Amino acid sequence: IRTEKIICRDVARGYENVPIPCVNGVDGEPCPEDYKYISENCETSTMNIDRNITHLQHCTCVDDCSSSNCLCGQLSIRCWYDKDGRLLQEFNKIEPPLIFECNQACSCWRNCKNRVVQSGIKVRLQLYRTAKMGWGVRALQTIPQGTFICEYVGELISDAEADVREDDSYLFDLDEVYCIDARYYGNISRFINHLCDPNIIPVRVFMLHQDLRFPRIAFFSSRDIRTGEELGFDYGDRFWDIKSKYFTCQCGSEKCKHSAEAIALE
C-alpha cells in the first residue's frame, strides 16, 4: 500500500501569494525539476510589447470603480467582477470578452474592484500525482463559480517559433499571432490536465499594458469546485487533432469527446 509523501513544500519558491505544495501517493516520481517555475510570463527573444504609459486607456474614477462611469469596465461593456472579485453569473463562459483591469494610468487606488487578476493567487492549490494523467492540480478548498484560480504563465513565442518546437504539449495559443509555451518556463498552470467537462475557463486580460497581441490568460472557475477536485480546462481541437493520433483522453467523464471509446463511436 502506497502512502502519500510531501515532496515539495512550494514549487513556486515563495513567488506566489500562497505556497503550492507537491505530493505523490501514486508512484516514486520525485518533484518535477525539468522546467523553470516562473510566476510571470517571460521572454527569450524581443517581443517589443507596447509598454508606453500614454497608450493606456484608463478611468477618471475617484471611487472604488463599482459604477458604470468606469472607462476600464466600459472597455468590456461593463466590469465583470462582483464585490467579492468573482465573475458575474451572466458572464459569457463560451466566448468571454477581453477584460481590461485598472492600471497605473487610472486615477483610482490599487485596491479598486477592477484588480482581481493583477492581485494574484488567492485559492489553495496542490500539485499532485494522478492515477493515469501524470501530474495534475487540485483544489485544497471549495471554490465558488467565477473565482480567479491562476494565470497561464510561460515563455512568449511567435506562431513561427511554436511551429518549430518539438514538445508542443504545454502550448497556449493567443489567436500577428503569439503563443505561451510553458514547457521550459511556466507556473502551476503548466500542470493542469485537460477535462472534456472543464471546471475552469481561460479569459484574456489586460493589466500593466494594453498590447492586444499579448493578452494575459486568467483561469476562472466555470462552476462551483468541490475540495479535492482536479482542475481542468478544455485544451481545444488543435491540441487533440494533433495528439489523438498518439494518446486518448483519460478524463473518465460520460461527456468525454476525445477518449478511445469516444473515437470509436464517431
Place this chain on the structure above:
Amino acid sequence: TEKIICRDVARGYENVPIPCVNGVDGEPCPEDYKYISENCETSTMNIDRNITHLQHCTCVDDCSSSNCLCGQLSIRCWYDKDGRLLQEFNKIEPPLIFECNQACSCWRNCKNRVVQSGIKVRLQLYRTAKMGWGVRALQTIPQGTFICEYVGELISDAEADVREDDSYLFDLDEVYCIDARYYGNISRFINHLCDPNIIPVRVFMLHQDLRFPRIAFFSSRDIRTGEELGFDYGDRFWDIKSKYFTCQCGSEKCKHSAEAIALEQSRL
C-alpha cells in the same frame, strides 16, 4: 494646526501608505503630476527583459554565503540579515548591486532582495518652512536601511537636454535619465541636503539592462523620527540652478547657499 490632507499619496501602490500633511500654509495636496510606484516610458526604451540574459545564482540556501553569484557581481552581498547595508559599504562611490531574480534557483525571500521588496519604513509628505513640500521619517531609521526608489519617466539624455522643467531629473550615468516631473513616486518630493542622510545606489533586479539601473535610496546614517530626508542632487543640478535660486539647507557644510556662491565667485 497640522492638517492631514491625503491619507495615501501612493493610492495603495506601496507596501505602506504615505500620508500628506500641511501645518505651514494653504497649499493643497499636490496633483500636478501622476503618482507611479514603478518607472514608466512615454517612448520606445526596449528594456532588455530576455530571461536568458540574466546572470543568476544556483544557491540552495538563503544566499547569505560568499559563493552566491549575484553577491559576487556586487563584489559581495552588502545586505546584513535585517536587509541593511553593511557599515563598511562605500557611500561615496557605491558599487552596482545585483539582487537575485526570477532566473536564480533561490526563493523570493532570500537575503539578496531588499530593494525589490519595496518600502517598509513610514514616510510622510509634508510642507516645509522654506523648500515647499518635503519628505520625512515617521519612525527612527537605522543607518543602511532601504528607504525608497527614485521612480519616474525613463528618458534619454537627448530628451532631457530639450525638456523645460529639469527640477526633477536624476541622471543614470549614450546615458539615460529618470524625469519625475510628470510621472513620479514619493522620491520626487525629497529635497536637496548638502549634508545628506540618504544616498542613491544603482540596483538591478528583474532585468540587467545597464542603461537602466534602478535608483535605491538607503540611509547614510541613523535618522530620527520627524527628520526630513535629503540626498545630494549634485553639481550638474546646482551648476544650472544656482543662477536662479540658492540652497536653503542651513548646514555649516552647505556648498550652494548665497554665501557659498559669493565665496566661490570671488575665488574664480
